[PDB]
């Protein structure tokens, strides 16, 4: 075999009768999944991976773009100078796992090293036809509803010295986040996170960062700027666009309390991640708009050199390709 690019196809368990938009997309876009697949463990084989140059990411990226553009019709879309208006009904929104598969003559190699950093050699390779079930969760700052690292926390980056590259933190223990828009301002919302789980999780990420930055102290800070999509923890819950302020999660002085409560706002006007332009959606539905999710990873940026001997990291995101990268790091397409 050998590294090669090819047209991949998706598989899932979407139900044609559900109105949920992901199920509708996958019904028309993907094929059924094999109930009993198998993977061959390769003997004495060692192959190189590079999660940062993986064409699988780009193919999934275009899939999710296609999904959102077809599912979430906005009331007004502003692209350049052309404003487009159209029907913007409220839809059912709940991501479902999607498998990415190699066609005939090709295969997908899976790195099974429990602590593979994402780039370099892997001495425990397996061959599959499809990846695992990957939920396409669009979010910034915090990676939600992903797969956890099997052993300890793992820090992933392409090059340490390039402060313009993103850092993908892969947690091993989940830190749940429960966000709600109570039934009784129709745009005010909040989330709750365990103060100890977060303070514990952050402490473990810090310890792993010292391994990569020897004689330097590690510190976290809030975002330094940008649109509201990336300066807060933004995500879509039941079709509504949530923007949750995380300044207190990464404030050193702030870390007395049991459940840290973040303030969130539902916005009808958003800056689209899938393209260039802004969109206006309809007001939020009524009732309890609740999303109990799992924080499984972090997207961090490192501040440009100061010397203070103290390295500072701030939450980031925006390029959803990295969201897909955190789940496809262990995979590569090869031609038989």
């Amino acid at each position: 075999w050998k590294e090669a690019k090819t047209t991949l196809f998706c598989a899932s368990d979407a139900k044609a009768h559900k109105e949920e938009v992901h199920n509708i997309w996958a019904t028309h876009a993907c094929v059924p999944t094999d109930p009993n697949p198998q993977e061959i463990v390769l003997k004495n084989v060692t192959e190189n991976f590079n999660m940062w140059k993986n064409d699988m990411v780009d193919q999934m990226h275009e899939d999710i773009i296609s999904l959102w553009d077809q599912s979430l019709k906005p009331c007004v879309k502003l692209t350049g100078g052309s404003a487009v208006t159209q029907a913007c009904p409220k839809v059912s929104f709940d991501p479902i796992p999607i498998h990415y598969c190699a066609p005939a003559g090709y295969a997908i190699l899976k790195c099974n090293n429990k602590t593979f950093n994402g780039t370099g050699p892997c001495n425990n390779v397996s061959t599959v036809q499809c990846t695992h079930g990957i939920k396409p969760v669009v979010s910034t700052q915090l990676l939600l509803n992903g797969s956890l690292a099997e052993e300890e926390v793992v820090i992933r980056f392409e090059n340490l010295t390039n402060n313009a590259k993103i850092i993908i933190v892969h947690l091993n223990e989940s830190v749940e986040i429960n966000c709600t828009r109570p039934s009784n301002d129709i745009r005010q919302a909040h989330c709750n996170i365990s103060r100890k789980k977060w303070n514990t999780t952050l402490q473990r990420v810090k310890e792993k960062l010292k391994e990569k930055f020897p004689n330097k102290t590690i510190q976290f800070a809030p975002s330094s700027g940008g649109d509201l999509e990336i300066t807060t923890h933004s995500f879509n819950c039941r079709g509504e666009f949530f923007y949750c302020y995380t300044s207190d999660l990464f404030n050193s002085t702030y870390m007395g309390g049991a459940n840290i409560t973040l303030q969130c706002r539902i916005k009808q006007i958003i800056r689209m991640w899938q393209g260039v332009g802004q969109a206006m959606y309809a007001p939020p539905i009524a009732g309890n708009i609740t999303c109990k999710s799992n924080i499984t990873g972090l997207l961090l940026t490192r501040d440009g050199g100061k010397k203070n001997d103290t390295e500072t990291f701030r939450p980031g995101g925006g390029d959803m390709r990295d969201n897909w990268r955190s789940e496809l790091y262990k995979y590569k397409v090869v031609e038989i």
Partner: antibody, heavy 122, light 104 residues
Framework: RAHLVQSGTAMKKPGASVRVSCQTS????????LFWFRQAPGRGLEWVGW????????NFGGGFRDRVTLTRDVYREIAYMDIRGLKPDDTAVYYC???????????????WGQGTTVVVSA | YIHVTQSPSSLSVSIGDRVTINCQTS??????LHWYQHKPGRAPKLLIH???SVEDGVPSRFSGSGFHTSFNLTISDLQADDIATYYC?????FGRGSRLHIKR
């Protein structure tokens, strides 16, 4: 094809503020990082910061985060650098320049603005 | 921090000569080293990226070489338009440059 055009010279006193603009054209604005560098007289180029025009993410070199604000207008495809608390040693030519790489960060700067002279003096 | 050193800082040359200048880095940078031309009152111009990839439109007499911590820019058949300062760069770290002038 890619072209950057900066605003004219600025004469400022200590403690004042300055806005330098960088009008782009001839390429996909949100697909290339924009960097800001400065060159004081008799010195080499010094990095100020960069901005990713997609959502406006930013980063800065030593000390500039405290005084410099980087923004952009996606519609007009123009980037802005604002500097507060101007000091005499901020006298320099400021440059905007784009990363040649599409959707990535290489730091190879293939298009430059003509430069903007900023003089800070009492 | 990456210290970037260039030598010679100043160099006299004659029209038609072959000229090569050196760039040194305090740590390994593989091949992520770029070269620029800069003249007074003008914006820098990218000549070569990633050690040896000459930029579009740059004359063929420019070439780059090196690896790890030592890199060279070479100009064959030097022309009057080539009298300028030349910077090497890795990430945010620009070298102070080598400046060419005419020997007499």
């Amino acid at each position: 094809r890619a072209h950057l055009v900066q605003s004219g010279t600025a004469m400022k006193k200590p403690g004042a503020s300055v806005r330098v603009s960088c009008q782009t054209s001839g390429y996909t604005f949100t697909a290339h990082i924009l960097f800001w560098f400065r060159q004081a007289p008799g010195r080499g180029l010094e990095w100020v910061g960069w901005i990713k025009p997609q959502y406006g993410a930013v980063n800065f070199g030593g000390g500039f985060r405290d005084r410099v604000t980087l923004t952009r207008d996606v519609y007009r495809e123009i980037a802005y650098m604002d500097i507060r608390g101007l000091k005499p040693d901020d006298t320099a030519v400021y440059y905007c320049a784009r990363d040649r790489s599409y959707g990535d960060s290489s730091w190879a700067l293939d298009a430059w603005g003509q430069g903007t002279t900023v003089v800070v003096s009492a | 921090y990456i210290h970037v050193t260039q030598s010679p800082s100043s160099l006299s040359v004659s029209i038609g000569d072959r000229v090569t200048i050196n760039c040194q880095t305090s740590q390994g940078v593989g091949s992520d080293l770029h070269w620029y031309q800069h003249k007074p009152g003008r914006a820098p111009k990218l000549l070569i990226h990633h050690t040896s990839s000459v930029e579009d439109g740059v004359p063929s007499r420019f070439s780059g070489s090196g690896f790890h911590t030592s890199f060279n820019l070479t100009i064959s058949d030097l022309q009057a338009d080539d009298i300028a300062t030349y910077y090497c760069q890795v990430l945010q770290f620009f070298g102070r440059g080598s400046r060419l002038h005419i020997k007499r």
